[PDB]
Design a protein around this ligand. Sequence first.
Ligand SMILES: [Mg+2]
Lengths: 146, 96, 84, 244, 266
Amino acid sequence: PTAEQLAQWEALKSVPIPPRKNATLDHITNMIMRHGKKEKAQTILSRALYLVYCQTRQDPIQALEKSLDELAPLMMTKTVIPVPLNKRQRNRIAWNWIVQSANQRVSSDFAVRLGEELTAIAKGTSSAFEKRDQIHKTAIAHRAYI
Amino acid sequence: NILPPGVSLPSKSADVAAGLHKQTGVDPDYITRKLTMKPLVMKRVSNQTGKGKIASFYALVVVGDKNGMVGLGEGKSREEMSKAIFKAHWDAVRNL
Amino acid sequence: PVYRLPPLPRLKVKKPIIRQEANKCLVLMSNLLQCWSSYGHMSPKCAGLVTELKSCTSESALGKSNINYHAARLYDRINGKPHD
Amino acid sequence: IHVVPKLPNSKALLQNGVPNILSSSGFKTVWFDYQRYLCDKLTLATAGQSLESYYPFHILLKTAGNPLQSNIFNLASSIHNNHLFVENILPSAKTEPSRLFLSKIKDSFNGSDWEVVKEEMIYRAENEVLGQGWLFLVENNEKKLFILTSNNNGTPYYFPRNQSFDLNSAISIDEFATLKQMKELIGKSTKLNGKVQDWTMPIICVNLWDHAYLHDYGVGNRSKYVKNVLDNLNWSVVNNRIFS
Amino acid sequence: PYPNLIPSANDKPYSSQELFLRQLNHSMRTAKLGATISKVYYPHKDIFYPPLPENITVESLMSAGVHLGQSTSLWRSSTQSYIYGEYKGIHIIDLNQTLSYLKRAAKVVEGVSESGGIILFLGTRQGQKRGLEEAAKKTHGYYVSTRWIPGTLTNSTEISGIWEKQEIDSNDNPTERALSPNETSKQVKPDLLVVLNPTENRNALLEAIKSRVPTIAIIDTDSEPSLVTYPIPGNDDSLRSVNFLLGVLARAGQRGLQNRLARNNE
Ligand SMILES: [Mg+2]
């Protein structure tokens, strides 16, 4: 081996391999997507996050991740026993709540509705917190059967 | 011809003698020229199985050289009495 | 007292009981729900549990006995049967 | 049982000792009695144990790291040493140092002659061994020949049991730092026994015990005895002891 | 001596392989200095330096543990005449009888090896392979230690008929003659079977009886003596006792073989 390429390999010894994709954003866009129209789903998501940034002036991806982590319930009662949820399931529940809230708004464009819903959630104004609280309350009530 | 190596082109006492010499090292000439077989009992036995009755032929034979050597043999075959008697002859020579 | 058995057709346990280790995720979840029942929902007094729960259930929500083999292998040796 | 080995030409050894070093009653004291005494003690200290199946070299390697077996180690060391020494002073089984030995002397002792290194060995034995001990010329894994002086029954093979420093009297900060480094290196080993690798092997061995020189030389005059030993080595053995 | 080794340069130290050869040179010359070891048992020497049958004493049979019989609760009473007494909950085997039977069996082995017969050493317990292999190799014999296929004698055509066979001269020198398929297919029956664990080898004993092969076996306190031609009362559970008796028989066979070769060279 040459010395320049040995140096390159030494430099990359420490560096971690960059991620191919953001798994959470990939999950959300795949949940938006229908009929394999991925580009349209990605456009909707990125436009909504653009509105979130423009109204909050913060990293919209971080705001979305904080929103999903806070809004999603940690466990849920199923047929009646509480069961823990993994990250993907939590994101699915939270995203469904977010979309339901966003589709109560006025804009014709889904990106605008979703973006301003995500802006309101990023500012701690969302009705889905009540849904999370009810799910958690049922889980507490049924903790005895775990 | 295309004869495979180890194959030959195309009586019972001779085959018994050859097989038993190969299997036990007894003398074929003695078996063929000094033993006399006499079947003693020849029966059809049967076993009940889920697919019907399976019949077998049973042969008890005695062999000897009329000089103080004697042996009894039993043989059993689901196909032919020739085969059961052959196996009985084999067994009798083995039990001398 | 010693109760020797007769010659058995086998030496086998019908339903051997095994070491079912409890799932850590369910224990963490039970502790967190107890904490919320006592100290209130979304209490800061066990956020650590929440963190730990989140860390353990993140990828997966949920995070055999050999007695018969050895019994069959050793029965003839140890049964104390008299010699043939 | 451990038995004293039979030496070549034992009758001549019992009749006239070793010419130029020992009389008959000196060699009898150092070998036919001391080696018997040591082998009897080793037998009594190892009989009915695993160590009875091992040669003294293997015994001293096995017991070198165990503090409570030190007495066995001592015996197993002295026995071994006492046969390394006797073997290389026996008349025969005119020998001269090999070219390889002198080459390694020139590559180790600052390009010095063999006689100069002999004088250095006399000096080293005179000073650093008060009382009982052993003098060695040893080869390390670096192909380097150096002089090693052990007190009592230290071994040349395993450096934590060289016993090259007398801690009864004062020591220099250099010696204390050497001991500290060796202690740290011993602690560096991962093996649960706490042993270390040491490829040092003895090339020349001289017995500085009173059993060797006292009868024939006197309380003093051990320098004369060591000089007689080094001037009259069996160089066939010493040359065979160096890896070719 | 040691090809494909590249020495090091005098400037640089010894390498790992050079250190290995250096300490080998030390080991063969000076490592054994200081004392010679006497009257100490070395397990390998029972296999490579077994004594002659005439030199065996009761003391050496006892030091090997041949006298230690089975638990008194597992006694097979047909072995009553072999027993010396009971001590510590086990039966002690009478080693005078063991010595007499062992000399008889050793002479049988020697006579069969001297006649050019086939000798088979059967032992299927854990660590018996080394002794069996060495006994076979010094008697020019054969051994099995893995498993005795039932029918190996009474069904030899179906089992051993495929394996190869060889013509040899009086000096046991391969002739390299071509055998006929008929010759290759024949049974080749052992002339002597010696079994180290007869209790777990009833199949072999019964086959030897049917195939009419004389047999030797180590008979412990729970074993049937009448199932073998030449019993040897002794402990069949200890590898030391088993290897002692096996080495004795193997040396007797070796002496028979040496006598055969001697007269065939005269
Ligand atoms: Mg036994």
